[PDB]
Amino acid sequence: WGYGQDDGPSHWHKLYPIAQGDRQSPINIISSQAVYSPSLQPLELSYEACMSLSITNNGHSVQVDFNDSDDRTVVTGGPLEGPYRLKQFHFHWGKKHDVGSEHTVDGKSFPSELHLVHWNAKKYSTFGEAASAPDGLAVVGVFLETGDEHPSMNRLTDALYMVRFKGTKAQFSCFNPKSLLPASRHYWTYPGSLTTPPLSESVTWIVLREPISISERQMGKFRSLLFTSEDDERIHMVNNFRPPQPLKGRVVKASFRA
Template sequence: MTGDQWGYGKEDGPSAWHINYPVALGNRQSPIDIVPDETTLDRDLGPIFLDYDSCTSINISNNGHSVVVEFVDSDDRSMIRGGPLDNPYRLKQFHFHWGEKGHEGSEHTVAGLGYASELHLVHWNAVKYRSFTDAASAPDGLAVLGIFLETGDDHRWLHLITDVLFMVKYKDSVTDFKGFNPKCLLPNRLHYWTYLGSLTTPPLHESVTWILLKEPIVVSDKQLGMFRMLLFNGEEEDERKKMENNFRPPQPLNGREVRSSN
């Protein structure tokens, strides 16, 4: 496994990431297991505000690890603010993590239990840093909004994404995906847990203020099954590796405080 080659298999998966990314053994790694009874109720934590009304999606792609929707982030049209954040952060992209059929696939767990999938909306601190790349390695550079997905009925809006997944079946495939507003993927209530952590994929920078919504959204098994039709590898490769179980297991808390907004 070289520095830019990593995955979720036995030899290149999370247990081996520390070989090329020593920070994997750091004190501020993500995800973690949230134990609600052990979190700190912080009445000074205000609500979070998601200013997504003018956000502009650009494309959807398969990066060989997940499916990613990218946004225009050259101005302040799509932001997260409030809560634990000192200033607004711009939306850069969102992506999903999921398991195999019938199994948990979220990265964060709650009292040791996982959800079917987890959605990450990645934002960066454009007030302090000149680019997403600069922010990604800074201690206060990123803010990631995490949303749990549990199985049940069809989600009213997720089909807008699943309907185009066939266009990005293979690694490095990309297609236009304009006009999508992720506001439709939010739960009704925005109560949250927050803690200081890291990216959950290499390079695992310890740069993330995590905001995990307590209320999950509901999606159907059929909708999640569409994600499992994606492949980890490229169209020119002979082997076909289904994209599933693309999540990192919980990491040690190492004494960090997890705060609750209510």
């Protein structure tokens, strides 16, 4: 599977039937239809500064992995019952600036979307095990728009050249993911799935209301990454996103009033 013309999202169901399931992600969030839920707890992203390990081009995205041996870097509150440890973060983006994000809001897409992936380590033994359970994962999504240069983002975009080819990785120490967060903690939440195969319906999605901004130069660095290996013909990593899926009666809750 991939994001090309022949192995892209519209064909994933041929391999993973759950692709046509009842709690698939991403979705188009219709703001006026989300339900204000004042019973939700405050969302807290408690991240340490030096828990990052490496940055890798896995052929589908660029991902930063974290040390998750303890609960020093976790998300808690909001719709979650307990803390979920951060395992990794990655991005989805487009070839053009009018597309790239997985989730959309009122039919609007952003050029990119950041996914901070957490798991219920207090309850499950491995990330893979948690990924098989309805309450196993929590992914915080942050939209990216282009505008002013993002200072912290420079560390990440400067490291992309060395991982331009599929299957390569580099050490990436002391990058605090809190630096990629907006000043607001308002969000939308709904029960969903992983947005890439195996498409398991084990994710509690937390999509932040406020996007962060990066420069066009920085966004351009992501488009310089490749889906291909060093020997293969070059194919730039772009449009690595899954389009919105049917809501199927699910209720989207909001921590705020629109």
